[PDB]
Amino acid sequence: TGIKAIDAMTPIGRGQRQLIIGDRKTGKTAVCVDTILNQRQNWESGDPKK
Amino acid sequence: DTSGRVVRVTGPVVDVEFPRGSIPELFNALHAEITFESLAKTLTLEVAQHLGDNLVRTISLQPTDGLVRGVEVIDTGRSISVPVGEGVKGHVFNALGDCLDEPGYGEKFEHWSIHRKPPAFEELEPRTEMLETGLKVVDLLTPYVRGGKIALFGGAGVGKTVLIQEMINRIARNFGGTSVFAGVGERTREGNDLWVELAEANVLKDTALVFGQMDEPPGTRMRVALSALTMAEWFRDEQGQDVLLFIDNIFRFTQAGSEVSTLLGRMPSAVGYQPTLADEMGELQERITSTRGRSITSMQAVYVPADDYTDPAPATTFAHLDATTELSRAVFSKGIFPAVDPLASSSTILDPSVVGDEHYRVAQEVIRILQRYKDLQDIIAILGIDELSEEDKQLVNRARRIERFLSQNMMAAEQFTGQPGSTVPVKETIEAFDRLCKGDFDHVPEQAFFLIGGLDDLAKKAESLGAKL
Amino acid sequence: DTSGRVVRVTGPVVDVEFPRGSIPELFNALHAEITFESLAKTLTLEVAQHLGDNLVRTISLQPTDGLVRGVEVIDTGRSISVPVGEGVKGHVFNALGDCLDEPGYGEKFEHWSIHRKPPAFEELEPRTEMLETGLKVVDLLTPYVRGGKIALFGGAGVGKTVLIQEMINRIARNFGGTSVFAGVGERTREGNDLWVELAEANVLKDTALVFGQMDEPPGTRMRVALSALTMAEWFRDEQGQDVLLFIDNIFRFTQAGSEVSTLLGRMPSAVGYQPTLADEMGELQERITSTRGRSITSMQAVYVPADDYTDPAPATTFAHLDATTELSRAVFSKGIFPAVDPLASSSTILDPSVVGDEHYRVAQEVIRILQRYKDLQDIIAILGIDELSEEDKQLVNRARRIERFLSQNMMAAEQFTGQPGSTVPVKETIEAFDRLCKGDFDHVPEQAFFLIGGLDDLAKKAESLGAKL
Ligand SMILES: Nc1ncnc2c1ncn2[C@@H]1O[C@H](COP(=O)(O)OP(=O)(O)OP(=O)(O)O)[C@@H](O)[C@H]1O
Ligand SMILES: Nc1ncnc2c1ncn2[C@@H]1O[C@H](COP(=O)(O)OP(=O)(O)O)[C@@H](O)[C@H]1O
Ligand SMILES: Nc1ncnc2c1ncn2[C@@H]1O[C@H](COP(=O)(O)OP(=O)(O)O)[C@@H](O)[C@H]1O
Ligand SMILES: [Mg+2]
Ligand SMILES: [Mg+2]
Ligand SMILES: [Mg+2]
Numbered sequence: 012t013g014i015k016a017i018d019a020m021t022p023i024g025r026g027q028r029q030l031i032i033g034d035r036k037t038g039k040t041a042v043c044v045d046t047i048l049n050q051r052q053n054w055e056s057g058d059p060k061k
Numbered sequence: 062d063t064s065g066r067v068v069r070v071t072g073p074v075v076d077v078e079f080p081r082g083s084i085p086e087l088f089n090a091l092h093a094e095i096t097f098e099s100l101a102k103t104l105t106l107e108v109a110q111h112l113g114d115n116l117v118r119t120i121s122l123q124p125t126d127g128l129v130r131g132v133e134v135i136d137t138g139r140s141i142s143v144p145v146g147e148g149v150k151g152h153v154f155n156a157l158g159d160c161l162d163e164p165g166y167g168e169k170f171e172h173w174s175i176h177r178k179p180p181a182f183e184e185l186e187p188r189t190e191m192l193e194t195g196l197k198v199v200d201l202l203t204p205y206v207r208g209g210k211i212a213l214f215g216g217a218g219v220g221k222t223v224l225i226q227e228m229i230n231r232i233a234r235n236f237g238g239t240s241v242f243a244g245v246g247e248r249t250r251e252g253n254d255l256w257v258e259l260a261e262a263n264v265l266k267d268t269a270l271v272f273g274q275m276d277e278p279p280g281t282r283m284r285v286a287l288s289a290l291t292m293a294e295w296f297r298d299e300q301g302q303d304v305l306l307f308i309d310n311i312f313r314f315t316q317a318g319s320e321v322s323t324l325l326g327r328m329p330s331a332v333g334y335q336p337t338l339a340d341e342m343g344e345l346q347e348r349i350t351s352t353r354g355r356s357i358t359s360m361q362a363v364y365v366p367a368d369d370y371t372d373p374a375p376a377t378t379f380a381h382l383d384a385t386t387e388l389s390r391a392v393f394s395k396g397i398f399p400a401v402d403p404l405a406s407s408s409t410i411l412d413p414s415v416v417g418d419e420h421y422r423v424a425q426e427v428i429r430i431l432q433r434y435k436d437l438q439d440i441i442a443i444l445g446i447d448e449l450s451e452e453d454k455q456l457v458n459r460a461r462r463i464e465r466f467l468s469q470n471m472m473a474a475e476q477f478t479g480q481p482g483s484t485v486p487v488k489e490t491i492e493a494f495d496r497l498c499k500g501d502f503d504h505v506p507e508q509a510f511f512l513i514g515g516l517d518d519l520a521k522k523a524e525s526l527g528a529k530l
Numbered sequence: 531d532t533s534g535r536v537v538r539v540t541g542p543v544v545d546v547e548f549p550r551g552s553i554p555e556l557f558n559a560l561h562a563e564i565t566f567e568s569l570a571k572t573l574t575l576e577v578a579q580h581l582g583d584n585l586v587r588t589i590s591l592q593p594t595d596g597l598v599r600g601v602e603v604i605d606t607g608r609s610i611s612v613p614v615g616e617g618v619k620g621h622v623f624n625a626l627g628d629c630l631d632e633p634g635y636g637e638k639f640e641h642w643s644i645h646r647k648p649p650a651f652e653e654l655e656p657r658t659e660m661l662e663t664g665l666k667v668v669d670l671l672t673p674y675v676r677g678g679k680i681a682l683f684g685g686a687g688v689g690k691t692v693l694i695q696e697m698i699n700r701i702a703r704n705f706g707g708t709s710v711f712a713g714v715g716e717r718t719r720e721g722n723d724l725w726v727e728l729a730e731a732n733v734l735k736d737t738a739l740v741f742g743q744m745d746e747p748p749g750t751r752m753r754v755a756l757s758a759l760t761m762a763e764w765f766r767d768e769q770g771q772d773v774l775l776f777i778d779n780i781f782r783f784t785q786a787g788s789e790v791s792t793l794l795g796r797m798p799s800a801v802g803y804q805p806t807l808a809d810e811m812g813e814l815q816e817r818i819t820s821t822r823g824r825s826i827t828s829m830q831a832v833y834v835p836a837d838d839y840t841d842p843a844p845a846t847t848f849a850h851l852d853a854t855t856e857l858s859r860a861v862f863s864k865g866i867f868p869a870v871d872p873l874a875s876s877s878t879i880l881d882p883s884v885v886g887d888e889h890y891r892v893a894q895e896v897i898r899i900l901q902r903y904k905d906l907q908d909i910i911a912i913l914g915i916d917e918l919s920e921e922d923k924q925l926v927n928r929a930r931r932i933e934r935f936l937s938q939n940m941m942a943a944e945q946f947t948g949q950p951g952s953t954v955p956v957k958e959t960i961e962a963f964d965r966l967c968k969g970d971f972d973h974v975p976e977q978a979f980f981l982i983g984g985l986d987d988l989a990k991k992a993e994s995l996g997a998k999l
Contacts, residue, residue, distance in 0.1 A: 026719070035379055036407045440912060
């Protein structure tokens with residue numbers, strides 16, 4: 012996800028279902044959009060396994 | 062022939078039977094007649110449901126007192142329409158489109174249906190331009206957006222209407238575009254007060270007023286917002302000039318929808334609200350938007366039932382906004398005006414890439430200090446301030462001074478207290494609150510931060526209280 | 531002929547019509563067909579109610595998407611039956627009795643109906659033999675009963691699945707009998723995890739797994755526990771040798787029964803549960819028992835909705851158990867694992883006549899110390915610890931060390947802390963907590979008690995922090 016807190020304490024693996032739960036205006040959409048944006052290098056790699 | 066016939070009358074909801082093949086489409090406007098000589102009128106019914114067996118359930122927009130079963134119902138063929146154009150600027154209108162101050166006016170205008178579709182997705186663009194008002198708390202912690210949607214949440218009697226009037230004074234007077242004001246299910250005295258004060262402030266010639274107030278059947282209070290929104294949509298699409306839209310208590314639209322739903326015989330959802338709460342709220346709020354190149358700055362007051370912010374109505378409204386100013390009764394009881402809860406209120410442009418680094422840093426520091434104060438509030442309530450650490454005592458002093466300096470004497474508060482208003486530029490606000498959160502005013506008493514403007518007002522009040530900066 | 535006809539399909543509940551005299555009995559299994567090529571399958575329907583006029587209301591065990599009104603429904607003349615025998619060991623099965631990893635396996639076995647009556651009262655015998663697990667807190671405060679009924683209570687995501695995996699590691703790995711694992715409405719990732727981890731430990735060859743998970747319709751989640759319980763009942767009554775029965779979140783049985791209670795036409799009970807809550811829970815939970823001379827050591831996980839132990843489902847489950855390990859989220863939030871609430875957990879063999887005088891005395895002293903600490907916590911949080919007595923400060927230090935020493939590094943949590951697991955005999959636990967309550971380690975820091983095993987691990991970690999004992 013590119014986030015220290017998530018990648019260190021609540022890590023997410025491929026195939027896992029992690030719930031982003033919270034109040035409004037706490038950074039849920041921020042966390043998810045950053046998770047999406049962090050895959051840019053994986054996309055630019057080229058192999059379908061990354 | 063093809064005319065209908067009233068069958069059931071359950072409050073302001075009327076069931077009408079039509080000859081087969083002549084069933085009116087949904088949202089169509091039908092006309093019935095009440096002949097009782099004191100209540101003689103012509104009811105405008107709006108088709109809501111097709112019940113089957115050629116029955117049609119409609120919502121009456123006028124009280125059905127005196128309506129008889131079996132009377133003739135005339136299908137007009139089109140939905141309820143309102144006048145649109147330049148001519149609507151300067152006049153007061155109904156939910157049905159009737160001019161109130163000058164009856165019969167506007168009947169020759171172009172008439173638009175009040176049921177439109179929201180703009181396409183490819184037309185939408187996010188709005189991230191700051192709208193500077195002159196209030197310290199609004200400009201610092203919840204900056205408003207040009208062409209974005211703004212709301213003022215609050216319980217009963219916390220200052221929603223006074224803040225609406227403050228924003229009318231600040232934004233609508235120096236404005237170049239056109240303004241629309243919908244009063245949905247609110248006081249009629251306030252509608253008259255606003256009409257008169259806009260007439261005298263020379264703002265009425267730019268403002269169109271549409272009023273469906275507390276003494277109206279739920280259909281009127283459900284459709285008046287759509288009428289005003291139709292006029293605003295005309296001003297945005299056909300003329301394209303920087304519309305402003307003020308809506309007083311959109312929650313009354315929600316509540317009238319609740320009552321209408323109860324009368325239509327729908328199953329009640331959680332709390333008791335209609336099952337189609339979010340759907341109606343979205344159908345309404347998605348037309349209040351700025352398209353690419355055409356602007357509508359919107360500002361709505363949202364009532365919070367029983368001071369319950371988890372109520373389904375405001376909780377559903379929250380998702381449709383760019384800046385939400387939340388007024389608390391805890392802040393209102395301390396004499397702070399506007400009674401803005403700084404920790405609950407928010408804005409989507411409080412972002413270092415929009416407002417700048419210093420604005421955002423000062424805002425985050427203010428919010429951190431106030432959150433620490435709120436964390437300590439329990440201990441402070443039982444043991445007082447004397448038991449905290451020295452760091453915590455310093456922070457609580459700074460936080461009391463900050464929460465008092467977010468208060469301000471508003472232009473609309475001169476009618477209650479007699480003291481005129483105050484405007485504070487945003488750069489001066491940032492500088493002042495930077496100095497507060499840095500500790501440059503920890504010697505000035507707690508008062509003298511109360512209901513003032515910038516730093517010059519603070520200096521004057523402190524020197525009148527024997528202090529200096 | 532004598533077949534049925536689908537009349538109504540409302541979600542998972544299907545109404546079927548049969549000719550007079552060919553009405554299937556209650557709990558029979560009927561077969562309908564879905565011929566849509568993307569969803570083609572054979573629906574199994576369990577007769578739930580006799581609606582009258584030859585109508586029959588059944589619950590479907592597969593999703594009803596693609597089912598047409600009027601299709602043929604074949605009455606099998608019997609209830610749902612599952613394969614039984616010493617040949618089900620080593621295989622993953624269905625709620626219907628179908629092998630998942632090797633389809634077709636078991637169609638030539640003896641098949642037992644999944645509906646039984648509980649053993650007669652004259653065959654019941656109390657079990658008062660301790661099952662030594664190896665966990666400090668479990669062996670001390672919640673001693674498990676050998677041949678008795680054990681449960682793990684707790685909210686969503688505290689310790690239940692990890693604790694059941696730990697107990698499969700401890701009790702089932704070196705067992706001389708059979709193990710049956712029912713995954714009732716749980717995750718499928720965890721089911722595959724358990725399958726693989728039992729194949730690794732060479733335990734799968736002795737274990738029979740029956741899975742009906744969260745993605746299944748409520749019929750499967752309602753009947754999978756009965757299928758696995760029928761397998762265990764065969765291993766207890768016919769073979770007669772030391773069954774172990776693990777059930778993950780059995781509650782899902784109650785919840786699946788609650789999802790269809792309104793579709794079956796029953797008025798809802800207090801908290802939205804079915805009116806037949808306790809009755810169905812008793813019909814199921816009374817078959818999970820050890821008769822005289824025939825042992826079934828049961829161990830269930832019980833989900834507590836929203837951490838509310840007053841919810842009717844856990845409150846009704848509480849009455850069927852000999853030992854309860856109740857997990858808290860307050861202990862989960864402090865990092866203490868397993869997150870057992872020592873003040874809420876209980877066991878019926880915590881009796882001076884069963885566990886001995888010293889075990890019981892040490893357990894009661896630990897409980898008293900922790901209760902006094904829980905009573906002082908609020909004072910300490912508001913007024914500070916220095917306001918207490920010297921006796922109370924001594925007790926607070928002891929209680930913090932004790933509540934940290936009840937935690938342990940489990941074998942099944944190496945995936946979460948990287949640390950290998952520990953095992954502590956019951957006598958070492960008794961003597962260690964005796965020394966703690968007496969005060970022999972009041973000079974060792976609060977750490978070095980946290981996630982360790984016996985007294986040797988305590989010495990190691992204390993010296994790792996510069997201390998002795
Ligand atoms: N890690 C972060 N650091 C700083 N600011 C953040 C962070 N995450 C989010 N924010 C800020 O929080 C604001 C709102 O967050 P976000 O919109 O992601 O919350 P949300 O869960 O989507 O709430 P809602 O759905 O009600 O809008 C954004 O303006 C963003 O600038
Ligand atoms: N900024 C202010 N300064 C002084 N008094 C105020 C201010 N705002 C509100 N009040 C007082 O509180 C009351 C709030 O009423 P209002 O906010 O209009 O009700 P509502 O929020 O229900 O529309 C007003 O009658 C006014 O007397
Ligand atoms: N003994 C333990 N050590 C470390 N972490 C644990 C332990 N027990 C539970 N956890 C944490 O709790 C999480 C979920 O616990 P689990 O028991 O699977 O939830 P549930 O009780 O709802 O099934 C795990 O991911 C794990 O990180
Ligand atoms: Mg969001
Ligand atoms: Mg008001
Ligand atoms: Mg679990």
